[PDB]
Amino acid sequence: GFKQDIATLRGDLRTYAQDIFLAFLNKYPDEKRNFKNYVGKSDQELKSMAKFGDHTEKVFNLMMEVADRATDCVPLASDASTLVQMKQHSGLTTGNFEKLFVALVEYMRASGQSFDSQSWDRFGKNLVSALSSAGMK
């Protein structure tokens, strides 16, 4: 289930974080307008850049924490607040997060692996809700 999925992802987090993030950027190309530095680069080019590997792992490090602290796929309000009030997210709307989680769910559904994709879908929607509550547009 969800909890084990957290453990699975953590067991190879750099690889999962990059593959999921790339799935997100490839599905929603318009989203690269939040990451100018990634434009015009193939997946392999991105994976070899320093800031890509570093930023994305750090994203998933915290995502997994937020996931881990959730109850029944409902994140802590404190965690939602943190994500909203991060300077690096000044721009974002919940739509950005929505898309990330659609790609994440899609990735999991197409993997050979018995991820609990329905729980990640709930998690994504509940985080979006919590981010709305904590003040993100």
Ligand code: HEM
């Ligand atoms: C649960 C979801 C997410 C978590 C946990 C998260 C977490 C983080 C963290 C920890 C950083 C700092 C990384 C660093 O600079 O070392 C970061 C930076 C950033 N996040 Fe998020 N993030 C999430 C979703 C998103 C989404 C959906 C977007 C845009 C669609 C986004 C855009 C950014 C940008 C633009 C930066 C910094 C600039 C860059 O390095 O590209 N984040 N995020």
